[PDB]
Structures are given as C-alpha cells and as structure tokens.
Amino acid sequence: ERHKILHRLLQE
Amino acid sequence: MQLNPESADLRALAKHLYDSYIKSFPLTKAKARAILTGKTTDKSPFVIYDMNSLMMGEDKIKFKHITPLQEQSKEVAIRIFQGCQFRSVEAVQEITEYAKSIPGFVNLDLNDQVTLLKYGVHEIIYTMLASLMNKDGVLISEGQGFMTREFLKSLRKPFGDFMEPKFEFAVKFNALELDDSDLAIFIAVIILSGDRPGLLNVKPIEDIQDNLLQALELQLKLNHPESSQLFAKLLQKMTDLRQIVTEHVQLLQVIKKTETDMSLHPLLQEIYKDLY
Numbered sequence: 001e002r003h004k005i006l007h008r009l010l011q012e
Numbered sequence: 013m014q015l016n017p018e019s020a021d022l023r024a025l026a027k028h029l030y031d032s033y034i035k036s037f038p039l040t041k042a043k044a045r046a047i048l049t050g051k052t053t054d055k056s057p058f059v060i061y062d063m064n065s066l067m068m069g070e071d072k073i074k075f076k077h078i079t080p081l082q083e084q085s086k087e088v089a090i091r092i093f094q095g096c097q098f099r100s101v102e103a104v105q106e107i108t109e110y111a112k113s114i115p116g117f118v119n120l121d122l123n124d125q126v127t128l129l130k131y132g133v134h135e136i137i138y139t140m141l142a143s144l145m146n147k148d149g150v151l152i153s154e155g156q157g158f159m160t161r162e163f164l165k166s167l168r169k170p171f172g173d174f175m176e177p178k179f180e181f182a183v184k185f186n187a188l189e190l191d192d193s194d195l196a197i198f199i200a201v202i203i204l205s206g207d208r209p210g211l212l213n214v215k216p217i218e219d220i221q222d223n224l225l226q227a228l229e230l231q232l233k234l235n236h237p238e239s240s241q242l243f244a245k246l247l248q249k250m251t252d253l254r255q256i257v258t259e260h261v262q263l264l265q266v267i268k269k270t271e272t273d274m275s276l277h278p279l280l281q282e283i284y285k286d287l288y
C-alpha cells in the first residue's frame with residue numbers, strides 16, 4: 001500500500 | 013566444531029546462497045578485484061578522473077541507462093546522480109530476486125517481506141559497493157568504467173559528499189578480506205534482521221536468521237583460519253551500515269530541500285518513505 005512497487009516486485 | 017548432519021546442512025545452505033548470489037548480481041567481488049588489478053582478459057575500465065575524462069567517458073562507455081534521444085541535465089553532478097538512481101533501482105530488483113532464493117523467506121508474511129526488503133536494500137548495496145571499491149575509486153557501469161574517489165569529492169555541494177562515507181566504509185570493510193562465499197551469507201543475514209521497524213511476525217524471521225548466522229560462522233571459521241574474530245567484527249559492521257544509511261538519508265534531504273525538484277525514482281521514494 002505504502003510500498004506498491006516493492007509489493008509488485010515480491011509478487012512476481 | 014564437528015562434522016555432523018547439522019553442519020552438512022549449514023554447508024549445503026552456504027552453497028545454495030552462493031550459487032544464487034552468483035546468478036543474482038552481475039559483478040561478483042572476485043571479478044571486481046581481477047578488474048581492479050588488471051588481471052583480466054576483459055578490456056579495461058575507462059578511467060574518469062577529471063571533467064575532460066568524464067565527458068570522454070559518456071561517449072566511449074555504453075551506459076545501460078541512456079540513449080541518444082533523452083535529455084539529460086547539463087550539470088555533470090546531476091547526471092552522475094541520475095545514473096546512481098538507475099543503478100540503485102536495478103539493484104533493488106537483484107536484491108529482491110536474491111531475497112526470494114533464501115530458503116523460507118518466500119513463506120514469510122508478504123507484508124514482512126516488504127519490510128525486510130525496504131530496510132535491507134541499502135545496507136546490502138553499501139556492503140556490495142565495497143567489492144567495487146579500492147581507495148582510489150569505484151568500478152562503474154558493470155566494470156566498464158572506474159570513477160576516481162577524488163573526482164567524486166569534487167562534485168559541487170552537496171553531491172561531492174555522497175560517496176566519501178562509502179569509500180571510508182569500504183576501506184575498513186575490505187580489510188576483512190571477505191570473498192563472495194562469505195558475502196552471500198552475510199547479505200542474507202542482513203535481509204533477515206528481525207529487529208526492523210514494523211514487523212508483524214518476528215519469530216519465523218529470527219528462526220531463519222539464526223540458521224543464516226550459523227551458516228555464516230561455520231563459513232568464516234572454515235574460510236579464514238588466520239582470523240580469530242571475523243564473525244564478530246563482521247556483525248559489528250552491520251552497525252556501521254545502519255549509520256551509513258542514516259547519514260545518506262539526511263544528505264538526501266539536503267537535495268530535494270535545496271535542489272531543483274530533480275526528484276527521486278518512485279521505487280527509491282518508497283524505500284526512503286518512513287525509513288528512520
């Protein structure tokens with residue numbers, strides 16, 4: 001949420 | 013110290029992290045030292061040591077991040093800053109990919125994974141930057157170039173103050189004489205620090221860092237016979253890393269506050285957000 005890009009990176 | 017199925021697993025863990033470490037980052041320490049001492053069939057990095065050489069370099073080095081079609085501040089300090097941003101953004105991805113290969117990490121709470129990455133990333137970056145440094149300068153553009161320490165110090169304020177603390181840190185850290193096998197485990201220990209702000213499910217993290225810490229100590233006892241205290245000396249370095257990050261954040265705020273809104277990449281903003 002506050003780390004949308006980092007979330008994406010970890011979710012792929 | 014013993015040869016039991018525990019230690020055999022420790023060593024298997026060390027090989028796995030190493031194998032993954034090799035394929036996750038471009039320029040290993042082994043290659044960097046080779047480049048740094050001429051011992052390589054690779055051409056030889058273009059040296060940037062003054063403004064004239066910087067300009068000649070932007071032409072004769074094929075930077076992964078530019079094209080003849082974009083602009084491209086007129087001011088060399090800002091341009092250098094921008095290349096750093098791009099390199100950091102790439103490194104965040106290599107570190108993520110590496111983090112995912114740490115046994116267990118990928119089963120943590122996804123929210124905690126984010127947190128470990130957010131705090132670990134720059135500590136790992138400065139750890140690994142030392143591999144590229146000697147006291148005279150730093151390999152750049154995947155070893156295609158070498159930018160001198162004094163040339164970096166001569167960029168206008170504040171930019172001339174970013175690399176210096178990293179060089180100082182590198183000189184001391186490189187004296188530890190760690191190799192890539194050591195480093196692969198160390199940076200894993202960093203990622204799995206259970207004392208980062210905002211973790212929700214700390215126990216599973218500490219359990220993994222624990223194995224990591226054993227794999228590290230075994231590794232340093234096997235790999236450095238002539239180094240009685242390497243394990244503790246190395247743990248202490250995690251401390252200087254946190255202060256390097258802190259210092260770097262405070263300088264980052266002289267920029268922004270006083271630059272030109274030559275903004276930070278959003279991934280980088282994300283990381284610095286509510287850091288310390």
Ligand SMILES: CC(C)(Oc1ccc(CCNC(=O)c2ccc(Cl)cc2)cc1)C(=O)O
Pocket residue numbers: 037093096097098099100103137140141144174260280
């Ligand atoms: C880019 C920025 C704003 O500030 C910085 C300025 C300079 C450097 C050092 C330049 N070197 C690198 O970024 C770098 C990163 C990863 C690896 Cl494997 C090698 C080299 C690092 C960070 C940052 O904090 O991300």
